[PDB]
RNA sequence: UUUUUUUUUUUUUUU
């Protein structure tokens, strides 16, 4: 008699959805699939605008610090770099502020997260020759 | 040529016999093993590594003391090929060490902490691959 | 006590997470549902004792020796074997 | 009294949706051990909880008379751990939560105990005269076996009571009773 | 032989058998696939200015490694021919009628 | 169990 091979049979055909240990998955995917498109369309656009004006970019940041804190804590001489701007995007997923000390987002004190400029392992890996929907801005053309 | 040397470190009951007495039982025991060797094929030809140069082979070392009777235990094979029980390592060691040392012979009369420490050596060897050596005879590593 | 065996697992002898492939690496079925048969006590010699008790009843009205009659009383004065199943204890004692 | 409480046991459970993710948690938890102040680190016991599965059904291409079907299997994994005599709460709770990796949630279950009147009796025994007229294994729990047996029996009792009461209050259309209106 | 068996034969043997640190590691630890890449620092390895900070000598200095590996392969055979064999004797004799 | 019982069997579990 195969015992391990038949595991989970009882909770497959003789169990209710509301009377089982299985949790729903559609709820998480609802807010996850939508956020992927936001980072793709607004990703390159944000970086292009930041790099549009190479010089004189740090002047705006320096003046802003004189109004919030008054005294420039990060002040440095002309012979030292001020900072490096990193293209970040806002958070759209309504995550709950859990009390997990080992979490990566529970201790977030700002509404902006870094964006990877290059990725070698695409998350939406297709199972075949099919492409990803919404990744063809230019309309198609037929030989006619 | 070996009975006199083993007359010291042995139990009292198993020491009064002479050399000739042991030979009578040994002679008949070997014949039975060879005759019975003619689910027993998984531990006879699969584990033995032929060389063509070895004129003789050892006895009663790893796998020579089995197949004494016409039929052998069924569950015995499951504990050698499928998986060797490592949890009972300490239990077997204490049950074999007491045979040589009865606490009244040449050996000391105090032995209690040996079983506790011997168990640790078995677990440490498990990471190295001690479990693998149980299934496959220790012949490939030597050569 | 009513629980001699105390089987507790450990870290070195724990089943792997992928238990489906474990069954495929065995010659025959080993693990099985919890099925253990208990031992049922038989008469434990009480069946033979009942037959022997009837013999002493017949050896009362024979006018035998006093020494031989002492054995009849000992059997009738039992407290853990004869019990009170049949209504013969008071009848034999009265006779 | 609050100061008289003590964590009797802490059942730690896991729920992983992948085989690789569950294996990573086991290795992470083991690495956190063998590093505490006491000689022997806390070694919890293992208790697998099977592997539930689910697979709905749907008709299969549209405009067909139901000649073929396509199923979508959704497997799952579970794991449970047991604790006894958790003297250090910081070295156990932090280690369990820090061993997570990926989408692998957890569900703890605390168990406290309060002591009653401390038995204090049996003073120095009387005396007169005639009138003349260690052994700790590597991968094993350091706690005594007697304590585990006493605590284990309690867990089995609560589970039986909860199942019996839950079955009683389980009927369709809650709040409906016979010939009530 | 009472003071040399209690905690000498069943304890000291564990220390000699605790070679997992050198056995678990790869055979070529100081040399990998990326061994000829830009891994060395150009500012501290090219001009050979330092003497102890860096040392590029793991390509031909296998004599030390060869001797170290040789001493770790002999004890392994002894454990399998003394420990594994000894355990098999008890297991086989446990079902002798 | 000679003061003992007074009886049909299921599709996850004594890890």
From TrEMBL, chain A:
Residues 137-144 have a biased composition (Pro residues). Residues 121-144 are annotated as: Disordered. This is Uncharacterized protein.
Automatic annotation (TrEMBL), chain B:
This is 30S ribosomal protein S5, putative. It comes from Toxoplasma gondii (strain ATCC 50611 / Me49). The chain holds residues 563 to 709 of 1140 of the full protein.
From TrEMBL, chain C:
This is Uncharacterized protein. The chain holds residues 457 to 551 of 930 of the full protein.
From TrEMBL, chain D:
Residues 37-60 have a biased composition (Low complexity). Residues 37-60 are annotated as: Disordered. This is Uncharacterized protein. It comes from Toxoplasma gondii (strain ATCC 50611 / Me49).
């Amino acid at each position: 008699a195969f015992r391990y091979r038949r595991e989970g049979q009882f909770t497959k055909f003789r169990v209710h959805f509301d009377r089982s240990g299985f949790r729903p998955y559609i709820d998480e995917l609802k807010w996850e699939i939508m956020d992927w498109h936001y980072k793709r369309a607004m990703g390159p656009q944000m970086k292009k605008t930041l790099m549009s004006y190479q010089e004189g970019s740090e002047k705006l940041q320096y003046m802003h610090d004189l109004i919030a804190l008054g005294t420039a804590k990060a002040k440095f001489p002309h012979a030292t770099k001020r900072f490096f701007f990193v293209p970040a995007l806002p958070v759209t997923i309504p995550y709950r502020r859990s009390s997990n000390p080992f979490c990566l987002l529970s201790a977030n004190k700002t509404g902006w997260l870094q964006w990877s400029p290059k990725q070698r392992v695409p998350f939406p890996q297709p199972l075949g020759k099919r492409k990803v929907g919404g990744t063809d801005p230019q309309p198609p053309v037929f030989p006619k | 040529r070996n009975w006199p040397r083993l007359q010291a470190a042995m139990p009292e009951p198993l020491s009064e016999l002479s050399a000739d007495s042991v030979g009578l039982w040994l002679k008949a025991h070997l014949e039975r093993v060879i005759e019975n060797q003619r689910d027993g094929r998984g531990r006879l030809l699969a584990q033995k590594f032929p060389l063509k140069s070895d004129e003789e082979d050892l006895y009663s070392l790893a796998d020579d003391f089995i197949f004494d009777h016409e039929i052998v235990d069924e569950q015995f094979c499951d504990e050698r090929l499928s998986q060797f029980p490592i949890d009972k390592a300490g239990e077997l060691f204490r049950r074999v060490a007491d045979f040589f040392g009865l606490t009244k012979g040449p050996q000391p009369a105090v032995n209690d902490a040996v079983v506790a420490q011997f168990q640790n050596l078995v677990y440490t060897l498990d990471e190295i691959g001690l479990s693998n050596w149980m299934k496959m005879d220790t012949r490939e590593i030597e050569e | 006590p009513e629980a001699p065996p105390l089987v507790l697992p450990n870290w070195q002898t724990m089943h792997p997470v992928d238990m489906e492939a474990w069954e495929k690496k065995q010659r025959r079925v080993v693990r099985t549902r919890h099925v253990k048969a208990k031992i049922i006590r038989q008469a434990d010699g009480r069946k033979l004792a009942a037959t022997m008790a009837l013999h002493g009843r017949q050896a009362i009205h024979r006018d035998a020796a006093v020494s031989s009659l002492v054995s009849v009383a000992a059997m009738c004065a039992s407290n853990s074997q004869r019990a009170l199943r049949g209504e013969l204890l008071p009848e034999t004692l009265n006779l | 009294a609050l100061s008289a409480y003590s964590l009797r046991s802490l059942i730690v459970t896991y729920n992983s949706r992948n085989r690789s993710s569950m294996n990573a948690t086991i290795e992470n938890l083991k690495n956190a051990l063998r590093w505490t102040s006491p000689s022997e680190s806390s070694s919890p016991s293992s208790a697998p909880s099977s592997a539930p599965s689910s697979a709905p059904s749907s008709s299969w291409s549209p405009f067909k008379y139901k000649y073929a079907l396509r199923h979508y299997v959704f497997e799952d994994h579970r794991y449970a751990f047991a604790f006894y005599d958790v003297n250090s709460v910081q070295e156990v709770v932090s280690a369990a939560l820090g061993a997570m990796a990926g989408e692998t949630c957890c569900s703890c279950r605390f168990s406290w105990r309060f002591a009653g009147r401390p038995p204090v009796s049996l003073p120095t025994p009387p005396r007169l005269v005639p009138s003349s007229r260690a052994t700790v294994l590597r991968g094993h729990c350091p706690t005594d076996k007697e304590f585990i047996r006493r605590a284990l029996e309690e867990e089995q009792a609560v589970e039986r009571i909860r199942k019996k009461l839950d079955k009683k209050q389980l009927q369709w259309f809650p709040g409906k009773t016979p010939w009530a209106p | 032989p009472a003071e040399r068996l209690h905690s000498l034969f069943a304890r000291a043997d564990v220390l000699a058998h605790l070679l997992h640190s050198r056995l678990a590691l790869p055979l070529l630890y100081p040399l990998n696939s990326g061994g000829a890449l830009t891994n060395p620092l150009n500012s501290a390895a090219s001009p050979d200015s330092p003497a102890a900070l860096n040392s590029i000598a793991t390509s031909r200095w296998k004599r030390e490694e060869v001797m170290s590996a040789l001493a770790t392969v002999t004890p392994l055979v002894l454990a399998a021919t003394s420990v594994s064999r000894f355990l098999k004797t008890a297991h086989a004799l446990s079902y002798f009628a």
